Design a protein around this ligand. Structure first.
Ligand SMILES: Nc1ncnc2c1c(I)cn2[C@@H]1O[C@H](CO)[C@@H](O)[C@H]1O
Ligand code: NA
Length: 341
């Protein structure tokens, strides 16, 4: 049995790769995962980055066991010496910190590589499919995270969480305390169990912390989920492809959320320029502000168009102000004159 091993920078069990190296899918294989892992550990540890001949990493023969073993042996020797350095006065790498954005992208790729065996069985009806998460949705999610600035008072739910990528990313990147994903379909929920196991393993391998999270199987339209959605502070829902009946039902669930509750989605649930009046009083735009977030630069979905998400914030002052105006005869005449102009 031939194999390649990479030591963990924090003394977790080593990553073991059999030879011949696995192919994970059409653009990802274990040889390049090994090279990228070494690169990302170098970003975590300056002394390792100094010791490695950094531009040579690309010049190894990924088809030669002897070449690849040479690279891994060089990394492993460097890790041993860094662990010795840390037994001295030098301070060890800080533990229990969150991964940088670049490291997190890599970790999520590596989780996906090890977890998802038949990518064809996935229902690629969203703007981007899970196969390209790192180049596309990952950056949309990262931008969203920086915009919404969640705190430890928040509770995050991904409705229709697929193989779990959004939940893993957000749980690794935010001070939010609790993170849930719920997914109805058997195949992605099955893959999500492996993703969960591998993410926890790799995060410990790199010495990085994530917040608490749970990936479940379920129907987000069930009665149990009504109460749960009502008590969620941030919802993510990739509703781009959902039919009118599903979006209608979701709207009814969001109408129970608390003030300041937020929903990020791939298709808006209300017009961006809602103007409340007598005929539209029961519509969801009466209780939320809706804005389009900055799009992802440099990619297009299979529609051929740029992609962006939509942020909805529960805000009942829209409705409060409308009723206060109705009360005042002057303002009521002016509202009727503006609707008719
Ligand atoms: N009612 C539901 N309860 C839980 N998950 C749901 C649904 C429905 I409709 C769709 N999905 C999942 O949503 C994902 C697409 O965003 C896809 O992964 C799709 O399977
Ligand atoms: Na170097």
């Amino acid at each position: 049995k031939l194999e390649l091993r990479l030591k963990s920078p924090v003394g977790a069990e080593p990553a073991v790769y059999p030879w011949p190296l696995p192919v994970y899918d059409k653009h990802h294989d274990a040889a390049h995962e090994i090279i990228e892992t070494i690169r990302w550990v170098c970003e975590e540890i300056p002394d390792l980055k100094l010791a490695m001949e950094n531009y040579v990493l690309i010049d190894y023969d990924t088809k030669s066991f002897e070449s690849m073993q040479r690279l891994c042996d060089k990394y492993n020797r460097a890790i041993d010496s860094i662990h010795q350095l840390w037994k001295g006065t030098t301070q060890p790498m800080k533990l229990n910190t969150r991964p940088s954005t670049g490291l997190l992208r890599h970790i999520l790729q590596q989780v996906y590589n090890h977890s998802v065996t038949d990518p064809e069985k996935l229902n690629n009806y969203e703007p981007f499919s899970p196969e390209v998460y790192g180049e596309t949705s990952f950056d949309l999610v990262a931008q969203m995270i920086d915009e919404i600035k969640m705190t430890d008072d928040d509770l995050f739910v991904d409705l229709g969480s697929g193989v779990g990528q959004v939940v893993l990313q957000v749980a690794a990147a935010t001070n939010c305390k609790h993170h849930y994903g719920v997914e109805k379909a058997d195949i992605p929920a099955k893959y999500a169990e492996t993703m969960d196991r591998e993410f926890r393993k790799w995060m410990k391998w790199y010495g990085k912390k994530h917040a608490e999270y749970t990936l479940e199987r379920g129907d987000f339209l069930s009665e149990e989920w009504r109460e749960r959605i009502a008590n969620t502070s941030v919802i993510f829902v990739n509703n781009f492809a959902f039919g009118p009946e599903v979006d209608h039902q979701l709207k009814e669930r969001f109408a129970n959320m608390k003030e300041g509750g937020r929903i990020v989605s791939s298709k808006p649930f209300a017009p961006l320029n809602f103007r409340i009046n007598s005929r539209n009083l029961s519509d969801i735009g009466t209780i939320m502000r809706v804005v389009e977030l900055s799009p992802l630069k440099g990619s297009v979905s299979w529609t051929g168009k740029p992609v962006s998400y939509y942020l909805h914030t529960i805000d009942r002052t829209i409705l409060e102000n409308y009723f206060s105006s109705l009360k005042n005869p002057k303002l009521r005449e002016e509202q009727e004159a503006a609707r008719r102009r």
